[PDB]
Amino acid sequence: ERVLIVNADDFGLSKGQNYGIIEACRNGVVTSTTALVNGAAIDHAAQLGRSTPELAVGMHFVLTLGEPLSAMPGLTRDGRLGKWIWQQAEEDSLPLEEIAHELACQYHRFVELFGHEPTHIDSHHHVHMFAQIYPIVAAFAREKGIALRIDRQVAAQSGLDQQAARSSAGFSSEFYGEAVSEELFLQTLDASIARGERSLEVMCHPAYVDRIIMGSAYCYPRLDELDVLTAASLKAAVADRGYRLGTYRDV
Ligand SMILES: [Zn+2]
């Protein structure tokens, strides 16, 4: 009747995150994950994905963290990606062709790593929701016949096409922080329901802690997210609300 997609971002970031996502899926409500095809532990993530058919995998398009697959002289500094892209976007100085080519390269490498088309595309730091990147990424997803994470409030603030590609009816980025709880997760569900949404994607970041995660400002809350997502109470509350646990393939 309703479909709930619970998507863990940043598959491939680190081995500890990889094991947190697998655990949140095998013993929790995580149904989906999106992978950094350039991540330090991407080959490790791909071995787990191949062994865990019950986990759907999409592509975490990334323009701000690793090294790109293709040469992007209009974007990289000392060969690396980084967070200057926000200012570069507002100065209308994005190398949009380089970006489109890197999107195609990350897609090609995704299929090599995992042996299937990604169920959908989202992005590290939500860069695919930038006004000038969104129509490129959505046209790509439409072209490939796959879905897109669509933050509908961001799209509406930026005049973007809500139908640019197939997606869930709504998306929530509100399940995060130090105060993560079962309550918080369920509040995003009940808020989606009141908006009249028949499907919802809920972002999350479960992980076991390793030295890579310890280098992030968001570290130990990932353990709390893992705890919430694997509690027996949560599956009951999801079912209680008429949700079927699902993936972007259902859209
Ligand atoms: Zn991310």
Author numbering: 1 to 251
Sentences copied from the publication:
The chitobiose (chb) operon is involved in the synthesis of chitooligosaccharide and is comprised of a BCARFG gene cluster. ChbG encodes a chitooligosaccharide deacetylase (CDA) which catalyzes the removal of one acetyl group from N,N’-diacetylchitobiose. It is considered a novel type of CDA due to its lack of sequence homology. ChbG is a unique COD that is conserved in bacteria to mammalian genomes.
Thereafter, the purified protein was crystallized, and the 1.83 Å crystal structure was solved using the molecular replacement phasing method and refined to Rwork = 20.24 % and Rfree = 25.02 %. Two molecules (A and B) were found in the crystallographic asymmetric unit. The kpChbG crystal structure showed the typical fold of the YdjC family and contained an unbalanced α/β barrel fold consisting of eleven α-helices (α1–α11) and seven β-sheets (β1–β7). An acetate molecule and metal ion were found in the putative active site of kpChbG. Clear metal ion density coordinated by D11, H61, and H125 was detected at the putative active site of kpChbG. The metal ion was identified as Zn2+ by inductively coupled plasma mass spectrometry (ICP-MS)23 with a detected concentration of 701.7 ppb (µg/kg) in around 30 µM of ChbG protein. The acetate ion was coordinated by L13, L66, S217, and R223. Residues D10 and H206 might be responsible for kpChbG deacetylation activity by working as a general base and acid, respectively, since they were also localized at the putative active site. The theoretical molecular weight of monomeric kpChbG, including the C-terminal his-tag is 30.2 kDa. Multi-angle light scattering (MALS) showed that the absolute molecular mass of kpChbG in solution was 64.9 kDa (2.1 % fitting error), which confirmed that kpChbG is a dimer in solution. Since kpChbG had the shortest α3/β3 connecting loop and the α9 helix was localized far from the α3/β3 connecting loop, the tentative active site of kpChbG showed an open conformation with a wider, deeper groove than observed in the other two homologs.
